[PDB]
Design an enzyme around this catalytic site. Structure first.
Site, PDB file in Angstrom:
ATOM      1  N   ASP A 166       0.652  -1.219  -0.039  1.00 58.63           N
ATOM      2  CA  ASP A 166       0.161   0.100  -0.096  1.00 58.63           C
ATOM      3  C   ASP A 166       0.996   1.095  -0.046  1.00 58.63           C
ATOM      4  O   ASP A 166       0.421   2.319   0.556  1.00 58.63           O
ATOM      5  CB  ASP A 166      -0.922   0.078   1.294  1.00 58.63           C
ATOM      6  CG  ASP A 166      -1.952   1.217   1.208  1.00 58.63           C
ATOM      7  OD1 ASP A 166      -2.507   1.622   0.317  1.00 58.63           O
ATOM      8  OD2 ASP A 166      -2.230   1.580   2.515  1.00 58.63           O
ATOM      9  N   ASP A 185      -3.370  -3.251  -1.943  1.00 62.89           N
ATOM     10  CA  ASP A 185      -4.579  -2.315  -1.839  1.00 62.89           C
ATOM     11  C   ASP A 185      -4.821  -1.313  -3.165  1.00 62.89           C
ATOM     12  O   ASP A 185      -3.420  -1.393  -4.073  1.00 62.89           O
ATOM     13  CB  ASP A 185      -4.263  -1.069  -0.716  1.00 62.89           C
ATOM     14  CG  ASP A 185      -5.403  -0.311  -0.372  1.00 62.89           C
ATOM     15  OD1 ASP A 185      -6.687  -0.661  -0.776  1.00 62.89           O
ATOM     16  OD2 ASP A 185      -5.497   0.845  -0.056  1.00 62.89           O
ATOM     17  N   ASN A 186      -5.740  -0.858  -3.594  1.00 59.38           N
ATOM     18  CA  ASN A 186      -5.730   0.226  -4.607  1.00 59.38           C
ATOM     19  C   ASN A 186      -5.410  -0.398  -5.941  1.00 59.38           C
ATOM     20  O   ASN A 186      -4.902   0.235  -6.891  1.00 59.38           O
ATOM     21  CB  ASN A 186      -4.741   1.331  -4.353  1.00 59.38           C
ATOM     22  CG  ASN A 186      -5.049   1.886  -2.991  1.00 59.38           C
ATOM     23  OD1 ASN A 186      -3.883   1.893  -2.242  1.00 59.38           O
ATOM     24  ND2 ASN A 186      -6.031   2.465  -2.834  1.00 59.38           N
ATOM     25  N   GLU A 223     -11.690   4.467   0.169  1.00 58.83           N
ATOM     26  CA  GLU A 223     -11.812   5.152   1.656  1.00 58.83           C
ATOM     27  C   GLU A 223     -12.212   6.769   1.340  1.00 58.83           C
ATOM     28  O   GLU A 223     -11.786   7.251   0.616  1.00 58.83           O
ATOM     29  CB  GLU A 223     -10.527   5.132   2.242  1.00 58.83           C
ATOM     30  CG  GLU A 223      -9.203   5.850   1.422  1.00 58.83           C
ATOM     31  CD  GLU A 223      -8.402   5.069   0.729  1.00 58.83           C
ATOM     32  OE1 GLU A 223      -8.972   3.830   0.188  1.00 58.83           O
ATOM     33  OE2 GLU A 223      -7.099   5.152   0.805  1.00 58.83           O
TER      34      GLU A 223
END
Ligand code: 611
Ligand code: MG
EC number: 2.1.1.6
Length: 213
Positions: free
Chosen positions: A139, A167-168, A197
């Protein structure tokens, strides 16, 4: 005063010391209502929690500490004796993350590594008494996911069954990493769809009634 300092201060002022859940909740409230920040957030956080609980890793590597939101999230679920190592290139972020962990009472389980992952990864085994990793959470800068995965492999830090959790992968996206892992017989991939988020973004209309010159 920086946004990251303001997050830490909010936690110190509002969260219960030694209570990781309270810390997470304070970070999420502040970033939901006062200032957006790139913490994984509670929605993806719950998926992380489920994965960690499934695999019960003894040794986790995090790339990218930021404010320590994910370090708190993961370290609170580790079993006794398990360890989290987290790499953070920005000394200000590393400092904030250490204070966040201290406040939550999780400091014994976590070791912060100050430096760039590309420089630190090759030192992990010798300097931090690491054999292979059970889990890696990615991340950090999105263009580093793929080169760091290749470096982990090169350095002998991956074993059969090591879980990478990134993540992402949709937003902002990691397209080279995602294509690589999904195309490689060396990885078995699963996607967990969620939400970015803190995206309740306030905007408004201004009415301005002319009154004459
Ligand atoms: O850019 C994002 N993340 C980059 C995070 C980077 C973190 O890791 C190091 S970089 C580094 C380099 C080398 N070694 C260790 C750390 C930075 O100093 C920061 O602590 C991001 C952006 C969005 N968004 O919507 O824009 C949403 C997200 O969830 C994100 O994670
Ligand atoms: Mg992220």
């Amino acid at each position: 005063d920086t946004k990251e300092q303001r997050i830490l201060r909010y936690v110190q002022q509002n969260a219960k010391p030694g209570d990781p859940q309270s810390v997470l909740e304070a970070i999420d409230t502040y970033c939901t209502q006062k200032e957006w920040a790139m913490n994984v957030g509670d929605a993806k956080g719950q998926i992380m929690d489920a994965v960690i609980r499934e695999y019960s890793p003894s040794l986790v590597l995090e790339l990218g500490a930021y404010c320590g939101y994910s370090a708190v999230r993961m370290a609170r679920l580790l079993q006794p004796g398990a360890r989290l190592l987290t790499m953070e290139i920005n000394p200000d972020c590393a400092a904030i993350t250490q204070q966040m962990l201290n406040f939550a009472g999780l400091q014994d389980k976590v070791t912060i590594l100050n430096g760039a992952s590309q420089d630190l990864i090759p030192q992990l085994k010798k300097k931090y008494d690491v054999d292979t990793l059970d889990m890696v959470f990615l991340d950090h800068w999105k263009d580093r996911y793929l080169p760091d995965t290749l470096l982990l492999e090169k350095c002998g830090l991956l074993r059969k069954g090591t879980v990478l959790l990134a993540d992402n992968v949709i937003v902002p996206g990691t397209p080279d990493f995602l294509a690589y892992v999904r195309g490689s017989s060396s990885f078995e991939c699963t996607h967990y769809s969620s939400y970015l988020e803190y995206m309740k973004v306030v905007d408004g209309l201004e009415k301005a009634i002319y009154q004459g010159p």
